[PDB]
């Protein structure tokens, strides 16, 4: 029963190390190459380094080189990945992975390096230019969750608050748009009300028609 | 360096066939062996393929892969709900070489309902983050089907490569996906430009929406 176990992993801020495991069992891990590959969130799998059966030779990424080290330990079947230097762009799911024609893959460790910390929102309307689409733009928090919710929750139809994207930077940004009558907006009054608790944030934001 | 190209998207019914591409060099798949990996939600790539056409034990006979030249192929006749999932090719570069190079990867979507375009909504920068000295172009896209699409910026006719950042489709309440996408700009370049494009491809259709400075 082949098993690989990823650990080692979590969140650590930009320039700073960490070293990964990967617990083998069920077969003779020492007769076997291994791999670490990764994949960022929502993005393709990524080779990061190898090693030989007795390692005697290791491969890296050129994107790795320099800053990671790949051992093993036959004595304890086991296989490491030593970080140093780590950045942004190496934030990903790092996978421990057998050579040959049939491979067998661990689940995984998730590493996120990031120098983010408890951030408010800064909230910005979307203002309107028979229907109109206004919203606000939920930017910069950390961590998540955000509600946002409309006129205190009096209004609900046509309201699509969008998944919030992870910027490079760590932090997030979302945005809450709602369809509404045209007829209506210069009538009716639309306000938006985030709330972070992380940070103790609630705001309320008026969106009015762009006017010069 | 060195990269395997698959088409980001493919889709067909349920008891279709469909096929997807995995286009290298002479070095890569035209020297070596070519495997397929199946990668469900949330859990490491599953081995369907290994020497360009051989199936593990208890990878179903419909999936069936070639190789010739410098491309390779993997064929699912007869689509099943369950084969919604991405599917990377995975070669190597030299002679005996152990790096792996994965291709860029393919959203396998079993046809569920029409085909859908997307609703695009493009938000200029509002006042009171220009008086801030932070300008932010909104790109809200919904209500597609697949959920895959592809996001490019335009300045005036010019493409924006610094500052964008893109989020992964969603699912919606309605079960169509949903997608964002945010190009960070100064208010120097907001208003030195007559206008900004967010192109949105889907199924090979694209909807733009533009967007200028001096429209209050």
């Known amino acids: 029963q082949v098993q690989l176990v990823e650990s080692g992993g979590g969140v650590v801020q930009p320039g700073r190390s960490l070293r990964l495991s990967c617990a083998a069992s069920?077969?003779?891990?020492?007769?076997?190459?291994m791999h670490w590959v990764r994949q960022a969130p929502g993005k393709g799998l990524e080779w990061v380094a190898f090693i030989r059966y007795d390692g005697s030779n290791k491969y890296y990424a050129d994107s790795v080189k320099g800053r990671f080290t790949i051992s093993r330990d036959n004595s304890k079947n086991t296989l490491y990945l030593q970080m140093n230097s780590l950045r942004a762009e190496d934030t990903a799911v790092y996978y421990c992975?057998?050579?040959?024609?049939?491979?067998?893959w661990g689940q995984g460790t998730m590493v996120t390096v990031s120098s983010a910390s408890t951030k408010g929102p800064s909230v910005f309307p979307l203002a309107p230019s028979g229907t109109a689409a206004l919203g606000c733009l939920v930017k910069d928090y950390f961590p998540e969750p955000v509600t946002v919710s409309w006129n205190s929750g009096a209004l609900t139809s046509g309201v699509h608050t969008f998944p919030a994207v992870l910027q490079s930077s760590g932090l997030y940004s979302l945005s809450s748009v709602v369809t509404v009558p045209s007829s209506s907006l210069g009538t009716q009054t639309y306000i938006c009300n985030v709330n972070h608790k992380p940070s103790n944030t609630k705001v309320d934001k008026k969106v009015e028609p762009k006017s010069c | 360096q060195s990269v395997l190209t698959q088409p980001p998207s493919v889709s067909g019914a349920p008891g279709q066939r469909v096929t997807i591409s995995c286009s290298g060099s002479?070095?890569?798949?035209?020297?070596?062996?070519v495997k397929w990996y199946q990668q469900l939600p949330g859990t490491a790539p599953k081995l369907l393929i290994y020497?360009?056409?051989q199936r593990p034990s208890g990878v179903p006979d419909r999936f069936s892969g070639s190789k010739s030249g410098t491309s390779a192929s993997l064929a699912i006749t007869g689509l099943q709900a369950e084969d919604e999932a991405d599917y990377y090719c995975?070669?190597?570069?030299?002679?005996?070489?152990?790096?792996?190079?994965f291709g860029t990867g393919t959203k396998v979507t079993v046809l569920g309902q029409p085909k859908a375009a997307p609703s695009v909504t493009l938000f200029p920068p509002s006042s009171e983050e220009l008086q801030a000295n932070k300008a932010t172009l909104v790109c809200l896209i919904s209500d597609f089907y697949p959920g895959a699409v592809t996001v490019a910026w335009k300045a005036d006719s010019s493409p924006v490569k610094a500052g964008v950042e893109t989020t992964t489709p969603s699912k919606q309440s309605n079960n169509k996906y949903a997608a964002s996408s945010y190009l960070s700009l100064t208010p120097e370049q907001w208003k030195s430009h007559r206008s900004y494009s967010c192109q949105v491809t889907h199924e090979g259709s694209t909807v733009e929406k533009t967007v200028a400075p001096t429209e209050c």
């Open positions: 995975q070669s190597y570069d030299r002679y005996t070489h152990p790096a792996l190079l």
């Open positions: 020497y360009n056409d």
């Open positions: 069920g077969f003779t891990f020492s007769s076997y190459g």
């Open positions: 002479r070095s890569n798949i035209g020297s070596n062996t």
């Open positions: 992975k057998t050579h040959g024609s049939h491979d067998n």
